[PDB]
Amino acid sequence: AKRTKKVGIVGKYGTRYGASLRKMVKKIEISQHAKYTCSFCGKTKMKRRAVGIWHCGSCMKTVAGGAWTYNTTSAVTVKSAIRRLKELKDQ
Amino acid sequence: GKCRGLRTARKLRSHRRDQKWHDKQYKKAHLGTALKANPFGGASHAKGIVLEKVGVEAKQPNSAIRKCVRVQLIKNGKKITAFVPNDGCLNFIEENDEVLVAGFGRKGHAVGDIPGVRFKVVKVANVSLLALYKGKKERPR
Amino acid sequence: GRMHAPGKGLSQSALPYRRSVPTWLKLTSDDVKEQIYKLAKKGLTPSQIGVILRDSHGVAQVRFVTGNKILRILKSKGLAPDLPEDLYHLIKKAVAVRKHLERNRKDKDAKFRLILIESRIHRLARYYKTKRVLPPNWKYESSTASALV
Amino acid sequence: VRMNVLADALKSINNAEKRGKRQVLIRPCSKVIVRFLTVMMKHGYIGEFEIIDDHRAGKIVVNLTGRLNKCGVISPRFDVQLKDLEKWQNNLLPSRQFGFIVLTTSAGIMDHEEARRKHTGGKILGFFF
RNA sequence: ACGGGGAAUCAGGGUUCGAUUCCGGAGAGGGAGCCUGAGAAACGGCUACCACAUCCAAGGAAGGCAGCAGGCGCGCAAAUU
RNA sequence: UAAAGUUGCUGCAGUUAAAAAGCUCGUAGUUGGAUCUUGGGAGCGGCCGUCCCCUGCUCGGCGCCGGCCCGAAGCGUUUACUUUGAAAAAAUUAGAGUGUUCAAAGCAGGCCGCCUGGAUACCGCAGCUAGGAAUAAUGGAAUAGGACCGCGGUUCUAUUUUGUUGGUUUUCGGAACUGAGGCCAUGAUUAAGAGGGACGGCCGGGGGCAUUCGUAUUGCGCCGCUAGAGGUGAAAUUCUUGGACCGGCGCAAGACGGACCAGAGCGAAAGCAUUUGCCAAGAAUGUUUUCAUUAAUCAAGAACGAAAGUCGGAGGUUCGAAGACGAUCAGAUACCGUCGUAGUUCCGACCAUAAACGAUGCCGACUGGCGAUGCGGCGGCGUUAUUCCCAUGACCCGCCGGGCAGCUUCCGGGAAACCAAAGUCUUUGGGUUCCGGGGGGAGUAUGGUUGCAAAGCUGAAACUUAAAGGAAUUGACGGAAGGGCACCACC
RNA sequence: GAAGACGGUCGAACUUGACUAUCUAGAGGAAGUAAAAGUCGUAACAAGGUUUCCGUAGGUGAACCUGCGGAAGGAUCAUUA
RNA sequence: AGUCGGCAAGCCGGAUCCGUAACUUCGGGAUAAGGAUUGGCUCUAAGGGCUCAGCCGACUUAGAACUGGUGCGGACCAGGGGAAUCCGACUGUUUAAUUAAAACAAAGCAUCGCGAAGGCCCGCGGCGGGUGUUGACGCGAUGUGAUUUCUGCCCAGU
């Protein structure tokens, strides 16, 4: 059954820390515990080891990533930006 | 009708059953609100006790002082302002006299000159007020 | 008018009155079928067998040269695809627009088109179920749909 | 969409009569339509009509005279007893002298007076006067 | 809101009423229990409790008109002990 | 109760008077294209009216020479509908009879012992019975487990029989199965100016992401020359020899996408405009492609939904709610002016409202022209581009489809304004959603629900009131416009 | 074969509590309507003297003002290569 | 009714089965509140392994009868409850030996300094030292104190 109405993972905090702080931590705490698909082996095993460090439990390959997400949006725009200046310098 | 299906009876009938409530005359007859707010309570007449004689003003260029009484019904205990109908009939009525009051004629609606008065006296102390006006009978004391 | 668009266009084919085999056509009722058999084996939906047939070989309607129609010809030979082609092409389209949508999630229009496409899938599905062409428990599920190209 | 086919046929030949066309074309032809036109043709209200029977729902070209006031259709097809058939032609027909209510019975499709002779009612189709 | 046969009002459709003499049901102040009998959960039959009320010598005894009349009450509102 | 066609099934209304959800999707509900048997014959009346026939497979007497005729019993897709019959308490209603002196009643009465009455109709809806087969549903055989025709075997069994007394096997009748057949005209309506899908070349400020460019604005740096510059009805606040404004050259930042731009296009609506690339989508057109009714409209439910607003980040040029100030004014906490916060921009979540307007639901049909216009297709002189012509572009003349519109009119409608739809409406019924019922109170109170909040959705009553309102007309009026006039007007 | 008793059953009624419906008191608060001709303005109707109106914000004695985006129910169906 | 004051004492208490309001940050409140049951004994039913039947094995729950001077969580163990106000969100910490609080801290919020020859700071001194094995999502300095909803006017004085 659906145990809670609108309090997901953050149900562990009970009635503490206020509603908004318990709401904006939910989106983050769902992310930092989700298992991602490893882009190297394909299996859904990318799991955050420590802050910024993401380890794939299958191919045993460690990746430097965001603090709470696997990929920071600021990073993916930088990777695509560098990829354009790279081919633009060497032509 | 809009839908003329061969078997749209419950759609047509439930519509009129719904839209009937938007008729003002129908909605007051099939809800207690009109019947509870009625001091008579669906009765055509009512007896009450006159406790003061008040004069009501007229409104529009029709200017005068309408003679009325503040009656307290004996079945409910509510207070209504009955209108002593005819000329010089206030001197028949006194204080603490039970009087038969009736509707005015517009069925819960202030009538013409008088503002907010929906009741008129017909009998006073179990003798018709018209008989007092014609002199056919006089007040027994 | 179109059932998922405001267009009221009037454009379609118009087969002639005469239902006879053309006087120019020299293919027998047999040889046309083995032509359908060959194209069906190399992979071709009954819709596009008909077009290839009336351009290269010049068959007006297969329903006239033989007594049956294309899909009825393939199913009697067992070469028909399992799920119908118009339902296949709708799932194929929904899979593409869903794959476009996972990256481009700000495309509210693609999200709107997806609902229109899926609504057409569930409409054909419940039709192909009453005609007992699909198993009564068949169900298009967005997840497992991509396995069916 | 086109739900009732007899309705599209009557409203077209009723429109073309008010305009004064000599002959009108109706797009779909059904068995009930041609049975309806003959009831009107046997009373002189329309002219000679023709069915262009192609390999689809055929087309009818009805020669029109100036004798048709209105040929309406009653939808849906209510059931008519012989007890209430007088009450229908009381508020559907112009006068008691002329006008006909076409209604289908098990005996076929005919006007309301033939339904009096054969003593059987049925579903009502339309009316013309 | 006891139901129905019906009643009022209508061109055709309807709308509103039906406590009321015919049929059916329900009930005898409120609930409950039961004796007798072919038939009753009977009340112009019993047994309780609740409400109300009568007679008493103060120990007790006795009661059920939504039967016909009649009275009180209630009311705008309804007859002869 | 009628009047009230002011509850509208018959029979209302929804452009502006009360009113069509912002928009699309969508389940119940409602409604659904066409298509399967007509004709012929005997008789009668003056080509016409009426009758019957196109029914198949146990028992008996006009009987007659296994067959025929006839009578009765049984079976023959199913409902809806319709016709018939039955069964259907009276009283009441309708209604027959009858001089209660008439009548409302009543069921009695009528003749010189007799003669008669106390009828009949309606009593739905549901259930029962018989007929009809249009209309509307529904089914049959296309992996043939199809229908018929005879079979061959297997199992059990009424048994009639074995003269009777037993067992046994069978012909025998029945029930079931299983193999080989034979035969069928052997079984699939059409392909909608319904729909879906495919395919073809296009098309479009459709959507998304990325990229690019453009002046301008603001700011800064430097250079020049200078005393005002700004702003206004007029000014001031403000900037200014600490060099403002102006001119030049640079730089940075964030917005915005001018002119081209249209009663043009695209999109469900909101909405959409520098370049180029990528991604997915789509209408219309073309189609001798495919599927074969898959459809229409839609309570519940769902997606999207300008601006403002909200919550997080990033950025903050311009503009600018609030605020401050300068004017104006009787006062201005307003209009005007100078600054200027939130906001305006982007990203990610909320919000679900707009005069979200065409104040006009959607689908379908029909009913006048006319000139254009956009997209696609088809046809045709000629002109002009490649040039080297055919084919393609650009014009030119037409036709077809649908698309935004326009003009015109006695189609027709409308209270009119006006409308080719707001028409085909007392000659009233194509299908289907929503929704209105005098004005206020009031979209308020309350309850519920959604939201972070703002609020949204749902949504009364008491009380009050004789009008409120629509379109149009004539006046008066206007710090409205255009002409003209007067020393009771000015110059 | 009476009284009486154990147990069972039906179970009135009382006590208590909860839920529910209807009516009703209430300081104070905040509306609506009516009465009259009060005070302060002048928002609206003529370009009503800042065009009006809508949604949404903020503000101000009060009508209202302003910002942003709409609408014409506008004072323009029109403005020229 | 005592008293400044229900201080102290008392009531409540386990478990099983029912039942559970306002309010709310939707998680709670909550053992809310309020009820009933509970012993002994004799049984029945259900819940497993090993080779249909046979052979082993454990505990536990539910139900029934009988029974006692209505007594049964018999000792022990073991929450009184409710509705409202004020303050502080909470957990945490604090005056060892008179003050455990409403004080302090706190997450959150908002300012300020600083791009390293630097900010802040130490040090009698030095090419000294800490932050710093650091680099603005960092370090240093302050105020306020979760959330929700807001945060107005004043730059004359200092």
Swiss-Prot record, chain A:
One GO term under biological process is:
translation
Q: Which domain of life is it from?
A: Eukaryota
- GO MF annotations, alphabetized: large ribosomal subunit rRNA binding; structural constituent of ribosome; zinc ion binding
The record's subcellular location field reads: Cytoplasm
Keywords attached to this Swiss-Prot or TrEMBL record, sorted alphabetically, are: Cytoplasm, Metal-binding, Ribonucleoprotein, Ribosomal protein, Zinc, Zinc-finger
Residues the entry annotates as binding Zn(2+): C38, C41, C56, C59
Give positions of the C4-type zinc fingers: 38-59
Output the Pfam families linked to this UniProt entry: Ribosomal_L37ae
Instruction: Give a Gene Ontology cellular component term annotated to this protein.
Output: cytosolic large ribosomal subunit
Q: Does the keyword Cytoplasm apply?
A: yes
Quaternary structure, per UniProt, is:
Component of the large ribosomal subunit.
Q: Give the similarity note.
A: Belongs to the eukaryotic ribosomal protein eL43 family.
Entry-linked PANTHER family:
60S RIBOSOMAL PROTEIN L37A (PTHR48188:SF2), 60S RIBOSOMAL PROTEIN L43 (PTHR48188)
Q: What does this protein do?
A: Component of the large ribosomal subunit. The ribosome is a large ribonucleoprotein complex responsible for the synthesis of proteins in the cell.
Official protein name in the record: Large ribosomal subunit protein eL43
State the organism of origin: Oryctolagus cuniculus
Q: What gene name is listed for this protein?
A: RPL37A
Swiss-Prot record, chain B:
Residue positions where 3-hydroxyproline is found in the record: P61
- List the Pfam families hit by this protein, alphabetically: Ribosom_S12_S23 (PF00164)
Q: Where is the composition biased (Basic residues)?
A: 1-19
**What Gene Ontology cellular component terms go with this record?**
cytosolic ribosome; nucleolus; rough endoplasmic reticulum; small ribosomal subunit
Q: Where is this region: Disordered?
A: 1-25
Lineage: superkingdom: Eukaryota
Q: What GO molecular-function term can you cite, just one? A: structural constituent of ribosome
* Positions carrying N6-acetyllysine: K134
Q: How is it modified after translation?
A: Hydroxylation at Pro-61 affects translation termination efficiency.
Which GO terms are recorded in the biological process aspect for this UniProt protein? translation
Where does the UniProt annotation locate this protein?
Cytoplasm, Cytosol; Cytoplasm; Rough endoplasmic reticulum; Nucleus, Nucleolus
Which residues are reported to carry the modification N6-succinyllysine?
K53
Tell me which CDD domains the record gives. Answer: Ribosomal_S23
What name goes with this protein? Small ribosomal subunit protein uS12
Q: What does this protein do?
A: Component of the ribosome, a large ribonucleoprotein complex responsible for the synthesis of proteins in the cell. The small ribosomal subunit (SSU) binds messenger RNAs (mRNAs) and translates the encoded message by selecting cognate aminoacyl-transfer RNA (tRNA) molecules. The large subunit (LSU) contains the ribosomal catalytic site termed the peptidyl transferase center (PTC), which catalyzes the formation of peptide bonds, thereby polymerizing the amino acids delivered by tRNAs into a polypeptide chain.
The reply on keyword Nucleotide-binding is no
* Quaternary structure annotation from Swiss-Prot or TrEMBL: Component of the 40S small ribosomal subunit. Part of the small subunit (SSU) processome, composed of more than 70 proteins and the RNA chaperone small nucleolar RNA (snoRNA) U3.
Swiss-Prot record, chain C:
Keyword line? Acetylation, Cytoplasm, Isopeptide bond, Nucleus, Phosphoprotein, Ribonucleoprotein, Ribosomal protein, Ubl conjugation
Q: Which residues carry this modification: Phosphoserine?
A: S29
Q: Which SUPFAM superfamilies match?
A: S15/NS1 RNA-binding domain
Q: How is it modified after translation?
A: Ubiquitinated at Lys-26 by RNF14 and RNF25 in response to ribosome collisions (ribosome stalling).
> Quick check: keyword Ribonucleoprotein in the entry?
yes
Q: Name one GO biological process term.
A: translation
- Cellular component GO terms, alphabetically? cytosolic ribosome; cytosolic small ribosomal subunit; nucleolus
Q: State where the protein is found.
A: Cytoplasm; Nucleus, Nucleolus
What GO molecular-function term can you cite, just one?
Answer: structural constituent of ribosome
Where are residues bearing Phosphotyrosine located in the sequence?
A: Y37
Matching InterPro entries, A to Z? Ribosomal_uS15, Ribosomal_uS15_arc_euk, Ribosomal_uS15_N, uS15_NS1_RNA-bd_sf
Sequence positions bearing N6-succinyllysine = K26, K33
Could you tell me at which residue positions the Glycyl lysine isopeptide (Lys-Gly) (interchain with G-Cter in SUMO2) crosslink is annotated in this chain? K42
Q: Does the keyword Zinc apply?
A: no
Biological role: Component of the small ribosomal subunit. The ribosome is a large ribonucleoprotein complex responsible for the synthesis of proteins in the cell. Part of the small subunit (SSU) processome, first precursor of the small eukaryotic ribosomal subunit. During the assembly of the SSU processome in the nucleolus, many ribosome biogenesis factors, an RNA chaperone and ribosomal proteins associate with the nascent pre-rRNA and work in concert to generate RNA folding, modifications, rearrangements and cleavage as well as targeted degradation of pre-ribosomal RNA by the RNA exosome.
Q: Which family does it belong to?
A: Belongs to the universal ribosomal protein uS15 family.
Protein name from the UniProt record: Small ribosomal subunit protein uS15
UniProtKB/Swiss-Prot annotation, chain D:
Q: Does the UniProt entry include the keyword Nucleus?
A: yes
UniProt KW Magnesium keyword: no
GO molecular function terms listed in the Swiss-Prot or TrEMBL record: structural constituent of ribosome
One Gene Ontology term, aspect cellular component: cytosolic ribosome
Q: Which residues carry this modification: N6-succinyllysine?
A: K87
Report the principal subcellular site: cytoplasm
Q: Which PROSITE patterns match?
A: RIBOSOMAL_S8
Q: Where in the cell does this protein reside?
A: Cytoplasm; Nucleus, Nucleolus
Q: Which NCBIfam families match?
A: PRK04034.1
The UniProt subunit note reads as follows:
Component of the 40S ribosomal subunit. Part of the small subunit (SSU) processome, composed of more than 70 proteins and the RNA chaperone small nucleolar RNA (snoRNA) U3.
The record's family statement is: Belongs to the universal ribosomal protein uS8 family.
What's the stated role of this polypeptide?
Component of the small ribosomal subunit. Part of the small subunit (SSU) processome, first precursor of the small eukaryotic ribosomal subunit. During the assembly of the SSU processome in the nucleolus, many ribosome biogenesis factors, an RNA chaperone and ribosomal proteins associate with the nascent pre-rRNA and work in concert to generate RNA folding, modifications, rearrangements and cleavage as well as targeted degradation of pre-ribosomal RNA by the RNA exosome. Required for proper erythropoiesis.
Name assigned to this protein = Small ribosomal subunit protein uS8
Provide the species name: Oryctolagus cuniculus (Rabbit)
